[PDB]
Design a protein around this ligand. Structure first.
Ligand SMILES: [Cl-]
Length: 213
């Protein structure tokens, strides 16, 4: 009868090569964004400039990763429900490619938007608190890699911020780009929200597995 612990969370964990590449790309973005006059003009929402690398002080300590289901060893809602799925068991330990379409910043978080393939969507949970469907967006829209958080912000916030951004962008509030950074168009969504839409999507290798701490 004896029950088994679940992981702390399921997700795609980037290889060291991929993790370092994306981490470097994220840091260059914060450096460039912070230098951009359009960003400096609207510093209200955050002769001195703001170093965003310092602002987003809390970074993922290990390799970067895209979380599917936070489980807390079973103490999270729907953890056992998610973990016993056939597709989760089959995909365990398996290698995937994650497509990064954009990098974004809010006063709370910094992260990368992941656009899941159809296969990868099968690994996306259905019972997320405040899902994409709740905001008129397709499931898996809030898939992401967290690059950094403000001091009193928890990592789960990054998914909420991406969702909020995509609801702005969906409803035609994207507008025209305020400018351009090296690797894409820079969009200002107001209220401290910024998005860099990559000219060429970035691909990273990651293994779908369970994290225990
Ligand atoms: Cl979702």
């Amino acid at each position: 009868l004896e029950k088994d612990f679940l992981p702390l969370s399921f997700g795609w964990f980037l290889t060291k090569k991929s993790s370092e590449t994306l981490r470097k790309a994220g840091q260059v973005f914060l450096e460039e964004l912070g230098n951009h006059k359009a960003f400096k003009k609207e510093l209200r929402h955050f002769k001195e400039k703001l170093e965003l690398v310092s602002y987003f002080g809390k970074r993922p300590p290990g390799v970067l990763h895209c979380t599917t289901k936070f489980c807390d060893y079973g103490k999270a809602a729907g953890a056992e429900e998610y973990a016993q799925q056939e597709v989760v068991k089959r995909s365990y330990g398996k290698a995937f490619k994650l497509s990064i379409s954009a990098l974004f910043v809010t006063p709370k978080t910094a992260g990368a938007q992941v656009v899941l393939t159809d296969q990868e969507l099968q690994l996306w949970p259905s019972d997320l608190d405040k899902p994409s469907a709740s905001e008129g967006l397709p499931p898996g829209s809030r898939a992401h890699v967290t690059l950094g958080c403000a001091a009193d912000v928890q990592p789960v916030q990054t998914g909420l911020d991406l969702l909020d951004i995509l609801q702005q962008v969906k409803g035609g509030s994207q507008g025209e780009a305020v400018g351009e950074l090296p690797r894409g168009k820079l969009y200002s969504l107001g209220k401290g929200r910024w998005m860099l839409s990559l000219t060429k999507k970035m691909e990273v290798k990651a293994i779908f597995t369970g994290y225990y701490g």
